[PDB]
Amino acid sequence: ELHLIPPLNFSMVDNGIFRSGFPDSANFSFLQTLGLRSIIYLCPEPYPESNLQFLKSNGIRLFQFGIEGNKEPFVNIPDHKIRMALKVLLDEKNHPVLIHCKRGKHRTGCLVGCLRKLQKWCLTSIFDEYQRFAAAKARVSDQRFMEIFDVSSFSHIPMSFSCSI
Ligand SMILES: O=[P-]([O-])[O-]
């Protein structure tokens, strides 16, 4: 009866936007129910054959913006890759979209936090959401990245897709 298995750390972010860690074949029946058009994939490793066949069968486009998986305190998240990923995220034609990395905590958490900055969330609310997913693996460096990330190049893009105005 209870047969659907959302991927690791799965959540809805906004209308048409989801976050998780790396899906495996046990998660495919759940992800099929979301009618995804897009995956925003934030790891540099090649997408596994299993996952590629799932995207092909389901008509899902892969956007890969590979961010190296550094450990604190040697973390350097590249601004350009997050910027490129946000541009994909802000085009509602790409929705519904799943953002994922390995565990859905660090790279995924940074992209979502930068989206919340565009949505005018105060930093403590952004950090609280980040921390809820990252839990014991919360990194100060991810939150510092969000704090100083320059969103000026996006301020003109309307967000009519959102549940928030
Ligand atoms: O895979 P992730 O938790 O950056």
Author numbering: 50 to 214
The authors write:
Here, we provide the ligand/enzyme crystal complexes for one such PTP outlier: Arabidopsis thaliana Plant and Fungi Atypical Dual Specificity Phosphatase 1 (AtPFA-DSP1), herein unveiled as a regioselective and efficient phosphatase towards inositol pyrophosphate (PP-InsP) signaling molecules. Although the WPD loop is missing its canonical tripeptide motif, this structural element contributes to catalysis by assisting PP-InsP delivery into the catalytic pocket, for a choreographed exchange with phosphate reaction product. Subsequently, an intramolecular proton donation by PP-InsP substrate is posited to substitute functionally for the absent aspartate/glutamate general-acid.
In experiments in which crystals of wild type AtPFA-DSP149–215 were soaked with reduced concentrations of 5-InsP7 at pH 8.0, we observed a near-planar, triangular-shaped electron density consistent with a metaphosphate; all three of its presumed P–O bonds are an appropriate 1.5 Å in length. There was no evidence of a pentacovalent phosphorane that would have signified an associative reaction pathway. The putative metaphosphate intermediate in wild type enzyme is stabilized by intensive polar contacts with a cluster of residues in the P-loop, Lys151, Arg152, Lys154, His155, and Arg156, including the latter’s positively charged guanidinium group. A metaphosphate is an excellent target for capturing a polarized water molecule, to generate the Pi end-product. We identified a potential candidate, Wat2, in both wild type and Cys150Ser mutant enzymes, and in both cases Wat2 could be activated by the His155 Janus residue. The Nδ1 in His155 is in the Nε2-protonated τ tautomer state, stabilized by a carbonyl oxygen from the backbone of Lys186. In addition, a π-cation interaction can be formed between Arg188 and His155 which is expected to further assist the latter’s deprotonation. Nevertheless, in the wild type enzyme, the 3.7 Å distance and 144° angle from Wat2 to the metaphosphate are not an optimal environment for this reaction, which in addition to the latter’s intensive contacts with P-loop residues (see above), are factors that may assist our crystallographic capture of this proposed intermediate state.
